[PDB]
Design a protein around this ligand. Structure first.
Ligand code: HEM
Ligand code: HEM
Ligand code: HEM
Ligand code: HEM
Lengths: 146, 141, 141, 146
């Protein structure tokens, strides 16, 4: 993905203040609550039938740290997302059978968690830069599907 | 919303399909899997090769359901109750795939019904298939 | 389908918005145009620069419409009847755009309602805006 | 776009049998019929109130020939669609203000029209190859939007 220099600065600057663990768990829980069909991939995590149950599940919190940690590493390779995520792409297609639409929905949920957490600092230009990043990551995770 | 003209057009087109309903359903799935490979993630237990038994069997079930929907066009939420339930609460296929399979059904019908696939009828089918998709995903959340 | 909890949730969140409704409408539009540039193709007559009165004006009208929908949440289709006719027969904006503005409205709310934007409320607001969208596109064909 | 040499050959062999004049008018006409909101760009063309009026309209037929002739040129350069359609992309954005979703809809209508015209010869693998083509053309036509 091409970001302009000010876009890259904006993205890196906000991210330096993000607590991945916490953000990770919120983004994944909100996913599971707003779009409940995504719960199909996590039957083994326990009862996911209420918002409170989802948001306090330790297996959701943990997986959310894992997901956003990988995402974090990608921020460091914005010029080669495809390469960086190729092995994960193949896993998600061949082993996990996750529909790539889920990556898009997670990205938008993540944008709403950043806005919620950062308030007025999550300005329209900053949002726009993150929207490019989340689309690029979703396209990279989807690239090796066949 | 389906107009009376829409209902007439669909009923006529599907009648012509008649006994080939199952064959056409299987063809549509095969078209879908090869054109839109992400759709295969919804069927990880299936043999998806051309002519597989699982695809042939699933295509007949799909087609039978559509035939029931045509017969209950004015009463689809009730006629498709068990299927809405199943997709929403067990299968949970992402909603975006319903438009992909709808396209593939339309292509298949086009390829088989030369005289009947007029522009008006194309429009009616597309509306009808979007209505069926809407009902099937109506209990997702 | 909105449940009573959903309705409750929307009435509360939208109430804390109150007199800023118009201001948020405008910021949502600006977020949409920067984030999803293809949406500018629907306002080729607008000055789309930061601070545009046209944008602020239109943001106020969108917000007032949503305010009306929340009030009439049990009967949105008759309540938004003039708008849906106008969108289907005059404006003719493509339907994917509704999903974009809705995501942007949610981002706007989240950025302004720290305390009120819980997962539950986020889920209800997403369903609410999807229902409005569905109403506004119900008469397109 | 990445087609295999067996896909490319299947595409070109079928296209040689297409009367682009006929197909173009039919494709544009169906677009306006199945998806009525696309009529907004064609007010200058006259009456489009009924299917018969659309499908009979001489400006629709003439316009369809131009669009599909431009599509046909693009088939000679599958490896560089972006380049072939760059000017057209800018034109559709800056002058005509056409939402790129319309290119996708037109792509899908074209596939239906080919299936209708060619029947059993429009096999699943041939369709798959044309789906890649039409997506490629739509992305190329959207590339200069800003
Ligand atoms: C930002 C996009 C995402 C990234 C970077 C990501 C990354 C990861 C990583 C690093 C793993 C661990 C893989 C391993 O064990 O080697 C994983 C596993 C997994 N992901 Fe993805 N993920 C993403 C989105 C999604 C979402 C949207 C879904 C479905 C809703 C999903 C479903 C899963 C599942 C089911 C596993 C296996 C969990 C387990 O074995 O406990 N992922 N993901
Ligand atoms: C035309 C709209 C559709 C209709 C009418 C339809 C109908 C059906 C029917 C009748 C069944 C069999 C239920 C039974 O076991 O009795 C079924 C199952 C299933 N459907 Fe849907 N379906 C539709 C679209 C889709 C979509 C788009 C997908 C995802 C790509 C999908 C995925 C499945 C799966 C995975 C099963 C289970 C197959 C098995 O395990 O044997 N369906 N559907
Ligand atoms: C939440 C969903 C939306 C609502 C509630 C809404 C509501 C409204 C209202 C109240 C008006 C003014 C009608 C009048 O002034 O008499 C309007 C006009 C308009 N809308 Fe929608 N709208 C929505 C989404 C959209 C979207 C997604 C688009 C396309 C991106 C769009 C494009 C337009 C345009 C171009 C106008 C005319 C503006 C002008 O020339 O002043 N609207 N809408
Ligand atoms: C395969 C996709 C398409 C291609 C290759 C294409 C190509 C073309 C070409 C060659 C022209 C003439 C340019 C000139 O010399 O002025 C044109 C004009 C135009 N196109 Fe596109 N087009 C496509 C899709 C669309 C669709 C989907 C729409 C709208 C729904 C659209 C709307 C228009 C309009 C409104 C004009 C101007 C017509 C006039 O002169 O009044 N096009 N296009």
């Amino acid at each position: 993905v091409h970001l302009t220099p000010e876009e890259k600065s904006a993205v890196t600057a906000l991210w330096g203040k993000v607590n991945v663990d916490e953000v990770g768990g919120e983004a994944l829980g909100r996913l599971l609550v707003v779009y409940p069909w995504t719960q199909r991939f996590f039957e083994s995590f326990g009862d996911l039938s209420t918002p409170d149950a989802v948001m306090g599940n330790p297996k959701v919190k943990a997986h959310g740290k894992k997901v956003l940690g990988a995402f974090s590493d990608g921020l460091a390779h914005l010029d080669n997302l495809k390469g960086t995520f190729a092995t994960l792409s193949e896993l998600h297609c061949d082993k996990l059978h996750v529909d790539p639409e889920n990556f898009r929905l997670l990205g938008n949920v993540l944008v709403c968690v950043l806005a919620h957490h950062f308030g007025k600092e999550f300005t329209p230009p900053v949002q726009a830069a993150y929207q490019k990043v989340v689309a690029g990551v979703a396209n990279a995770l989807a690239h090796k599907y066949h | 919303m389906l107009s009376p003209a829409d209902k007439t057009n669909v009923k006529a087109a599907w009648g012509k399909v008649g006994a080939h309903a199952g064959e056409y359903g299987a063809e549509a799935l095969e078209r879908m899997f090869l054109s839109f490979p992400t759709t295969k993630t919804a069927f990880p237990h299936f043999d998806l090769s051309h002519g597989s038994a699982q695809v042939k069997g699933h295509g007949k079930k799909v087609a039978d359901a559509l035939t029931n929907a045509v017969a209950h066009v004015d009463d689809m939420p009730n006629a498709l109750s068990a299927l809405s339930d199943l997709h929403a609460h067990k299968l949970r296929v992402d909603p975006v795939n319903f438009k992909l399979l709808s396209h593939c059904l339309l292509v298949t019908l086009a390829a088989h019904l030369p005289a009947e696939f007029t522009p008006a009828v194309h429009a009616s089918l597309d509306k009808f298939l979007a209505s069926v998709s809407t009902v099937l995903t109506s209990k997702y959340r």
